């Protein structure tokens, strides 16, 4: 059907988070994996960039073990940047 | 100075009555002597509780020591509230403001929540039954909503023991599904042991799991079962055996004959029984403080029928209640003091963790300070995965005559030898099963290859 | 009162109970073999000599949740009828993928409760949750409703589910025009001829 | 300074609407102009596409004279499509 | 729009139709020039329709 | 001489820096190293000099 960048973002953050939840306590290790799975499920305009790139970066640098919930809650509002390149 | 006090012991409670008698003997004084009337009943039965209560009442007791259940607790609170009779219990604390009730058991809520905050648990599973009430459940739910916790609440009390085999396997299957490891058990010790056995049976006691037992009896039950399992277990202890008081008491307890005092020959004691002992202390000291303040609570005539309508309470009762609530003493449960409502105040709950060598205290919990911490505390053959490519990894001409890493030759083989040589480990060369480098399947979303 | 009725030698008793008193009734009626019939909430377990007029609401509610396909919502309850329904929907939330926020509105005193609701729905604004299930007696229901309308959360985009058999027993005219979806349960159909006739006699 | 396509979308719809409000009865005629102003004000990942393309098309095909409010209210949730192409 | 000529006995849906017609134009900003009673009435009706 | 800050410098590493900073979402301030060396370890004092 039709693509929506906004819907893609809101889906992206949620799928990333829900993915990281199974990985609790190792959470800081798996950010990119879960970001891959989320980019797959929510789709992306550029396969390299992913659904939301800025959120991924924010999570990667912020997320600490077991600190997940607060980290995600802080990072989910973050600007995704340009989903072209 | 004979002081008549009624008491209610659930059938099958032995060590409690044993420690009760020991308490009667130790805290006995020449000034006054308590004259207990013991009544055994079904604690869950409201009718039985009512009957026993009115029986003790008509007998004209100045106080009552007993136990209640989630079913019967309202009967006790309401009747003690109406007839102004003081009730002392080791049983779970009531959630609310209940007069004329002295609850020996400390509130476990703070300790548990502080423990969760200590271990930094974002998401966990909570296994409960309806016995001691859902008060703790409500607490952890509201605190979960406030602290943004994702909590799985599961009632294990409504599962029938006759049909419960696969129900628990399905339970921990659903619990394994989400990969959720952290687990809290708030249950009666029997149900606790059952769940534990089901865990070792299903092999959920392996590494990666963390269990939190919420009760004051952490060392009262057998911890030897899951001790060597390799899963972390934490809990709460209301009795510190390192204390001199508790140590000497334990010496006298362990020297006692089992025939006269049932189940009283032991290294340890269940926390309920200890709370009973401390309760005896509280009663004795209360009436002593009544005599020192020169106030005579003596009954002029019989109380009459409890159900007589309209009920009329005796005046002295209020004085006896205040007398009990104003008591501050030192006992097996630590510092014992009560507020206006009768709940425990300023107590100390030792926070303990089960290790390989055995249990140890990792800290303590105070009503104010919250959690405070006490004293801070070969080579495996490396599996090398590789794929056949020229000239990276190739089979030797004579390879059938050789075995292991000698079978393969190539650039990557030599590089592997070098890496292992500098990093100092033994390595086993293996060829990948599916024969791919690496990939993500668009369907199964599973990584295949090295 | 029960023993009073008993000594009078009654053959049956019709009455009501509370979360506190229900065990007294069950135990005494079970022991003395006196039949007790009540409109009040059904006891969870097997209790003899009690005839519970009120139907079980659990299944209807859960089926309704599955019908509206709610993945995440907020559940507002009180300790008056017990936590049985709460426990139930929590267990079914554990079985399903449901994300449920359980909040106790019962321990809040009516005299001082103004900002309690503002803070409640503030915390409800935190998660952005627009789906809410109210399990409460009609009084708390009505209060919470007024509090919802005051803060203007009864506009479009919100969906409320009232759990009780009294959906038309409380005043719905307040949130009727707000534009928010409201769902509930009715145990009495006024469209039935029996009920229609009864109402005709009742209004006179 | 990331653009964040969702914020870009909300801005896009908002500026288009606020612009079309100035033209009463001519609303269906000026849709493209106001869309131009909105793409200018909110920025765009692709200058050709604009901030939200699907919303623009939706408005152009739906909006009739004096029908502004309802039309916009219907079109503001629509998927914007591919912002890079 | 004159809100003064509306009789209180039959006035329920008159306000709903009023604010529906006001929703037509998408008009948000509104000035109320009225007696305190009519003011209260219009306000309550505003709260009812969630505007 | 007429400019200031990151606008003072141009080059490959400059553009790359702009890209990396743009990707990681931080503000960056370009500065030239004090000793003007890349990096080294003095065998005596065991002190690292350079960037
Ligand atoms: C006991 O706890 C109360 C709060 O319930 C606190 O005010 C008091 O200072 C504490 N007392 C001691 C001795 O810690």
Cα-atom radius of gyration of chain B: 30 Å
Structural class estimated from helices and strands of chain B: alpha/beta
Oligomeric state of this protein:
part of a larger assembly
User: Remind me, CATH topology of chain A?
Assistant: Four Helix Bundle (Hemerythrin (Met), subunit A)
**Alpha-carbon distance between the two ends of chain B:** 86 Å
For the sheet with most strands of chain A, the description reads:
none
Strand neighbour order, sheet with most strands of chain B: 7-6-8-9-10-14-15-16
Ligand types: 2-acetamido-2-deoxy-beta-D-glucopyranose
Q: Brief overview, please?
A:
The structure is cut from a larger assembly and holds 2 copies of chain A (85 residues) and 4 copies of chain B. By secondary structure, chain A is mainly alpha-helical.
Q: Could you explain the architecture of this structure?
A:
The structure is cut from a larger assembly and holds two copies of chain A (85 residues) and four copies of chain B. The longest helix of chain A is centred in the first third of the chain and has 18 residues, at 5-22. With 85 residues, chain A is mostly helical. Chain A has one domain (1-85): Four Helix Bundle (Hemerythrin (Met), subunit A). Chain A has helices spanning 5-22, 31-42, 53-62, 68-75. Chain B has helices spanning 15-26, 46-58, 73-83, 109-119, 135-147, 166-177, 189-202, 224-227, 244-255, 271-292, 316-325, 411-423, and strands spanning 2-10, 33-41, 63-65, 87-89, 101-103, 123-128, 150-155, 183-186, 210-213, 232-237, 328-331, 334-338, 344-345, 348-354, 359-366, 370-373, 382-386, 394-395, 408-409, 427-431, 438-440, 447-449. Chain B has an eight-stranded mixed sheet with strand order 7-6-8-9-10-14-15-16. A five-stranded parallel sheet of chain B has the order 2-1-3-4-5, with helices on both faces. In chain B, helix 1 links the parallel strand 1 and strand 2 (33-41). The longest helix of chain B has 22 residues, at 271-292. Chain B is 33% helix and 23% strand. Chain B is an alpha/beta fold and 450 residues long. Among the domains of chain B are: 108-244 and 351-373, Rossmann fold; 382-450, Periplasmic binding protein-like II (D-Maltodextrin-Binding Protein, domain 2). Chain B is built from twelve helices and 22 strands. Classes of the chains: A mainly alpha (85), B alpha/beta (450). The structure holds 2-acetamido-2-deoxy-beta-D-glucopyranose. Chain B: Glycans are attached at residues 232, 346, 379. Chain B: It is a multi-pass membrane protein.
């Amino acid at each position: 059907g039709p693509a929506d960048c906004c819907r893609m973002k809101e889906c992206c953050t949620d799928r990333v988070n829900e993915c990281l939840q199974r990985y609790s306590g190792r959470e800081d290790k798996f950010v990119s994996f879960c970001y891959q799975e989320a980019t797959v499920t929510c789709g992306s305009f550029n396969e390299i960039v992913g659904c939301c790139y800025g959120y991924q970066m924010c999570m990667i640098r912020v997320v600490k073990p077991n600190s997940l919930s607060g980290a995600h809650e802080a990072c989910k509002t973050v600007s995704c940047g340009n989903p072209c390149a | 100075n004979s002081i008549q006090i009624g008491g209610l012991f659930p059938r099958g409670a032995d060590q409690e009555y044993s420690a009760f008698r020991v308490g009667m003997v130790q805290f006995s004084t020449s000034e006054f002597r308590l004259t207990p009337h013991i009544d055994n009943l079904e604690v869950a039965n409201s009718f039985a509780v009512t009957n026993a209560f009115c029986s003790q009442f008509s007998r004209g007791v100045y106080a009552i020591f007993g136990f209640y259940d989630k079913k019967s607790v309202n009967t006790i609170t309401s009747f003690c509230g109406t007839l102004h009779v003081s009730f002392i219990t080791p049983s779970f604390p009531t959630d609310g403001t209940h007069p004329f009730v002295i609850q020996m058991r400390p509130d476990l809520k703070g300790a548990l929540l502080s423990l969760i905050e200590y271990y930094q648990w974002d998401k966990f599973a909570y296994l409960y039954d309806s016995d001691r009430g859902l008060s703790t459940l409500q607490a952890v739910l509201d605190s979960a909503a406030e602290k943004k916790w994702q909590v799985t609440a599961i009632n294990v009390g409504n599962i029938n023991n006759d049909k419960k085999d696969e129900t628990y396997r399905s339970l921990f299957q659903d619990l394994e599904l989400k990969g959720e490891r952290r687990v809290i058990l708030d249950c009666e010790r029997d149900k606790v042991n059952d769940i534990v056995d089901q865990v070792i049976t299903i092999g959920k006691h392996v590494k990666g799991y963390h269990y939190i037992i919420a009760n004051l009896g952490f060392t009262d039950g057998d911890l030897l079962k899951i001790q060597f399992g390799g899963a972390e277990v934490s809990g709460f202890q209301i009795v510190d055996y390192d204390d001199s008081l508790v140590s000497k008491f334990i010496e006298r307890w362990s020297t006692l004959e089992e025939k006269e005092y049932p189940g009283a020959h032991t290294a340890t004691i269940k926390y309920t029984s200890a709370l009973t002992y401390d309760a005896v202390q509280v009663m004795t000291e209360a009436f002593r403080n009544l005599r020192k303040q020169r106030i005579e609570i003596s009954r002029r005539g019989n109380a009459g029928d409890c159900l007589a309508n309209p009920a009329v309470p005796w005046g002295q009762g209020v004085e006896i209640e205040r007398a009990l609530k104003q008591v501050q003493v030192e006992g097996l449960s630590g510092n014992i003091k009560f507020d206006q409502n009768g709940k425990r105040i300023n107590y100390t709950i030792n926070i303990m963790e089960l290790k390989t060598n055995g249990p140890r205290k990792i800290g303590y919990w105070s009503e104010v300070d919250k959690m405070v911490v006490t004293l801070t505390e070969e080579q495996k053959t490396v599996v090398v995965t590789t794929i056949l490519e020229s000239p990276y990894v190739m089979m030797k001409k004579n390879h059938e005559m050789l075995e292991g890493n000698e079978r393969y030759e190539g650039y990557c083989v030599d590089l592997a030898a070098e890496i292992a040589k500098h990093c100092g480990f033994k390595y086993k060369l293996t060829i990948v099963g599916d024969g791919k480098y690496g990939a993500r399947d668009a369907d199964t979303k599973i990584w295949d290859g090295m």
